[PDB]
């Protein structure tokens, strides 16, 4: 269809496997997701950089080790899935793409604002966070967010608080 109306993700290849539904149901109940569909969105972009990580190891260009690969390592580091590395040194750039292949789906699924509340002391359960966010009681440093699947970047991690003027506080 048109660009505004194409679809992003399809059905899996084998609809009924007992060896696939058991593995995935351990992820839904642990992280607290409502649809099987919304799990499929976060794994495809996990596949797409791994499609790009393989090419940069095999590039024979002298500048591709300098530009696009360094433009690969930053984007994960701003969201904070990767921890941090020195971009001036050449040999650690090789280590950065080699560390990329050792990730999982849970490295992406853990930096979500629903789970990141419960891992802090604000929420008791993960289901306590989904019921709390939608009423509008939780705020980042200036903004009041109502989307539990909002990705939390690296620098904005420590500044999660309650809303100061909500009924969840005293006022």
């Amino acid at each position: 269809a048109n660009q505004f109306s194409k679809r992003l993700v399809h059905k899996p290849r084998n609809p009924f496997e007992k060896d696939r539904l058991i593995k995935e149901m351990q992820i839904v109940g642990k992280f607290g997701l409502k649809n099987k569909h919304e799990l499929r969105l976060v794994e495809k972009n996990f596949s797409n950089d791994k499609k790009e990580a393989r090419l940069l190891l095999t590039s024979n260009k002298v500048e591709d080790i300098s530009i696009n690969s360094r433009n690969l390592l930053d984007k994960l580091c701003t969201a904070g899935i990767l921890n941090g590395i020195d971009l001036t040194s050449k040999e650690e750039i090789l280590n950065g793409l080699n560390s990329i292949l050792d990730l999982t789906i849970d490295s992406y699924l853990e930096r979500t604002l629903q789970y990141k509340v419960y891992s802090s002391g604000l929420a008791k359960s993960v289901h306590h966070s989904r019921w709390l966010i939608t009423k509008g009681q939780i705020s980042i440093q200036g903004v009041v967010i109502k989307r539990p699947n909002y990705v939390v970047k690296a620098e904005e991690e420590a500044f999660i608080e309650l809303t100061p003027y909500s009924w969840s506080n005293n006022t």
């Binding site: 903004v143 967010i145 109502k146 003027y165």
Partner: protein, 125 residues
Amino acid sequence: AANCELEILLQKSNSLLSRKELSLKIHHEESPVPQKKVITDKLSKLFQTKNDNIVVYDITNTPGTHTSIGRVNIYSNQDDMKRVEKSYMVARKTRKPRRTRKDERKKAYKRFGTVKRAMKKAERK
């Protein structure tokens, strides 16, 4: 519960249109967005021109932040404000339908003369 503060960002002067421009910042802490009646009163103290010479527009609230943005235009006297602004922007501070104007124009291009001739042929019958 009504709260309003004023912060002036990017003050610029316009000599040809004889006006000044600035971008306002409103802090409404535990209140809705303010009506424009009270904000026009507040600029009369800081800018000593009359409150009728001042016009403000486009008050948009950033969502879930308790802070809104708007714009300010001021003039010296009253008559150039009616000259340089648009019509509906003036008439907010203080015609004929479309389907009838199309009917009289089409009857006007039919005639080969005045209404004196249009009655004069009816005199003969």
